[PDB]
Amino acid sequence: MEAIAKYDFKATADDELSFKRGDILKVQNWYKAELNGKDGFIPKNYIEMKPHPWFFGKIPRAKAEEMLSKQRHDGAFLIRESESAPGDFSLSVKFGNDVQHFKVLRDGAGKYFLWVVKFNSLNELVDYHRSTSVSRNQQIFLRDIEQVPQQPTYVQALFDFDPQEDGELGFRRGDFIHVMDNSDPNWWKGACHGQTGMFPRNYVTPVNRNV
Amino acid sequence: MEAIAKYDFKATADDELSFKRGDILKVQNWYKAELNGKDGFIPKNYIEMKPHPWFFGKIPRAKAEEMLSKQRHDGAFLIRESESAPGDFSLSVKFGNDVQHFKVLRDGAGKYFLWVVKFNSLNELVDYHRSTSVSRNQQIFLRDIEQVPQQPTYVQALFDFDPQEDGELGFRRGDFIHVMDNSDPNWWKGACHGQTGMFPRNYVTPVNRNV
């Protein structure tokens, strides 16, 4: 399960892992995990769910311009949907000290492209323009924004789940269980009553954000 | 499907429905919907998903204090989990001009209680304390907070879904589809490519917020 560090941490002893707030770490109060090759232990309460690296919903151009402009690397970006003209997507990149826009076009035959080359998904396009520059300026790569830990994502339980086996997380119906990993289609890694663990997606209806 | 008004609207005709931003509406570019008893039409891109009315995750006491204090009614409240001491919940209420808390404790066999009576869910507790006061000052009732529309919640699609019949929403593998209603365990009402509609949950993996 990966996760983003939410607080910095200094190796409290020799079996640990030193990370800065915002680092993404590939992860009984302490999980073992790994960061840049070197690995070790990590307190449970210092990690949170890894947010979307680049899809920034309907984040308006201003804000787009803002957070992106304030970044320690050229080619930092997000992809955003239009509030206004809904069905439309637009790339935004950190060019020098400025945000340089690009409309991403979808040719009816389900495919997104910016100019000449067509792809089957915005991701494919993205990684495509990780190494193959997004302009006649053969440097401007798309590298992920310096990401920061966000408020916890919380699901709610429909039916009690007495934790059948070891690793399973127990919760009653009504329980607000804090979700740490949810990338997997049937088993989500939550945290619920002091203990943390796996739990079947299908027993839990979401709790929509409000902060 | 319910929804929170995102922008104020003035009844642009005789079949309409003016609502102020934050209003919760019981909801081809115009949905037919109803408000205070009288109903009519509403533009589709003036509504967003109804957030959780009272569960405010790991919202710190300060903040709790903060937004709760700024409320147009006594008894406004939230329920929040505690950043530090994980497994515990605490109610916060708008008493006159100030926030008065109460630890919600759970008694072993999974039940939440404030003092004398036990319930099997925070919800059960909350509705209990809507009619039946939460002090000895026999008015303090749990009135839900003046709710305001949040950032859109977006799922991503695992597998194409040529829409089987219409009301169904069509999208390819990779598409970031915007969720309006996801209360129902198997069929979520999204909005994906100009068109909006139903689509089975099992086809989309979430997209974690970062704004």
Side-chain angles (χ1 to χ4, degrees):
Chain A
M1 140 184 161
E2 55 196 48
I4 184 166
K6 66 161 150 125
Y7 296 145
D8 317 279
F9 184 59
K10 307 303 274 67
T12 212
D14 278 81
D15 33 280
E16 44 42 83
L17 205 9
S18 159
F19 45 92
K20 358 179 258 266
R21 153 181 292 257
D23 272 2
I24 13 77
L25 322 156
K26 305 164 208 186
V27 81
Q28 298 189 99
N29 214 92
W30 286 77
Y31 295 71
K32 173 153 258 280
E34 310 205 305
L35 202 160
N36 233 306
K38 264 183 181 72
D39 52 281
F41 297 87
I42 213 124
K44 203 145 55 109
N45 31 358
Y46 278 64
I47 56 169
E48 191 68 56
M49 175 165 294
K50 149 157 188 42
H52 210 308
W54 38 271
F55 194 72
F56 274 67
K58 300 212 282 216
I59 222 49
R61 229 287 150 156
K63 271 183 84 179
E65 291 175 289
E66 259 77 291
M67 67 176 91
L68 206 30
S69 112
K70 206 164 147 283
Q71 288 269 334
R72 175 217 287 80
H73 40 203
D74 242 85
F77 67 120
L78 37 57
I79 274 93
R80 348 159 312 225
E81 196 152 325
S82 324
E83 186 297 301
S84 44
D88 290 73
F89 289 125
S90 326
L91 244 94
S92 310
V93 190
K94 202 56 217 321
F95 216 25
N97 11 105
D98 334 281
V99 278
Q100 149 211 42
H101 177 286
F102 298 66
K103 5 89 187 195
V104 49
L105 294 333
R106 189 165 163 278
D107 61 33
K111 278 345 144 183
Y112 305 106
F113 62 94
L114 5 69
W115 330 287
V116 314
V117 279
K118 177 213 223 270
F119 330 74
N120 309 336
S121 69
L122 261 129
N123 319 57
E124 265 159 79
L125 182 165
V126 180
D127 4 280
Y128 181 72
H129 283 163
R130 247 152 170 92
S131 282
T132 292
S133 174
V134 77
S135 263
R136 44 144 87 241
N137 242 156
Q138 263 52 62
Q139 123 53 253
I140 76 163
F141 284 165
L142 294 169
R143 218 310 156 287
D144 315 348
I145 282 172
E146 268 124 18
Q147 256 315 11
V148 318
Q150 220 105 326
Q151 287 281 80
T153 331
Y154 273 57
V155 290
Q156 190 167 7
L158 272 344
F159 338 113
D160 352 49
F161 174 75
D162 218 88
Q164 281 150 224
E165 189 246 13
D166 45 89
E168 310 215 345
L169 207 184
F171 58 88
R172 293 170 55 64
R173 158 164 162 138
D175 283 5
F176 285 97
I177 107 89
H178 166 145
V179 175
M180 244 136 66
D181 185 61
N182 66 12
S183 53
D184 179 276
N186 321 93
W187 282 83
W188 277 0
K189 230 198 152 165
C192 174
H193 265 107
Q195 88 128 146
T196 65
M198 288 340 236
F199 81 111
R201 173 171 193 195
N202 32 288
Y203 286 91
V204 109
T205 221
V207 151
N208 295 142
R209 49 191 294 170
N210 23 187
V211 180
Chain B
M1 170 228 278
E2 300 188 313
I4 186 176
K6 153 207 261 177
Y7 308 148
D8 300 56
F9 183 61
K10 212 292 184 328
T12 184
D14 60 302
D15 61 283
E16 72 345 1
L17 160 50
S18 337
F19 51 76
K20 180 182 184 64
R21 150 181 178 179
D23 264 10
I24 303 283
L25 299 147
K26 262 162 284 330
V27 79
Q28 132 189 18
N29 278 168
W30 285 81
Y31 286 100
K32 207 245 165 59
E34 37 164 47
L35 181 57
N36 80 307
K38 297 188 71 190
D39 40 77
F41 285 79
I42 271 94
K44 182 181 311 250
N45 78 332
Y46 275 79
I47 61 169
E48 182 79 50
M49 203 164 46
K50 171 179 196 170
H52 199 280
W54 33 266
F55 196 76
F56 278 91
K58 300 195 136 136
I59 209 71
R61 166 216 297 280
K63 182 70 179 293
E65 267 159 353
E66 296 186 301
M67 61 177 95
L68 189 61
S69 88
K70 307 137 100 46
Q71 285 293 309
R72 276 137 94 66
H73 45 353
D74 284 337
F77 70 106
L78 40 131
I79 277 216
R80 84 236 195 238
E81 179 163 319
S82 209
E83 185 91 41
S84 46
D88 298 359
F89 292 135
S90 64
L91 210 175
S92 307
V93 161
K94 152 139 252 283
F95 170 13
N97 79 301
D98 62 12
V99 205
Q100 199 167 211
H101 303 292
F102 302 78
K103 281 213 333 296
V104 185
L105 328 166
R106 156 195 231 245
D107 69 42
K111 316 288 97 270
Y112 301 104
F113 70 94
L114 296 60
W115 309 294
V116 168
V117 301
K118 280 151 187 197
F119 320 97
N120 305 66
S121 66
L122 296 184
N123 312 50
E124 193 166 282
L125 181 173
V126 170
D127 313 321
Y128 172 76
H129 279 131
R130 210 170 320 266
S131 58
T132 299
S133 181
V134 64
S135 239
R136 43 89 190 48
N137 312 327
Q138 315 308 55
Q139 184 50 14
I140 323 191
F141 300 137
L142 299 176
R143 263 240 261 149
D144 311 344
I145 281 188
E146 294 287 303
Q147 203 93 50
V148 63
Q150 296 300 298
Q151 265 303 88
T153 318
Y154 278 89
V155 338
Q156 184 171 41
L158 263 3
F159 323 124
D160 319 49
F161 168 78
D162 215 332
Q164 181 172 20
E165 82 135 284
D166 242 273
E168 291 184 31
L169 195 187
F171 55 85
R172 276 235 144 68
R173 153 179 252 274
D175 288 359
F176 291 108
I177 61 91
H178 166 168
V179 170
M180 183 78 43
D181 181 24
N182 72 3
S183 61
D184 176 271
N186 308 332
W187 287 92
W188 287 8
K189 191 167 179 179
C192 171
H193 269 146
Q195 57 184 316
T196 84
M198 272 333 167
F199 71 93
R201 184 191 194 165
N202 312 66
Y203 269 78
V204 280
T205 184
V207 166
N208 309 135
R209 78 94 77 79
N210 48 214
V211 156

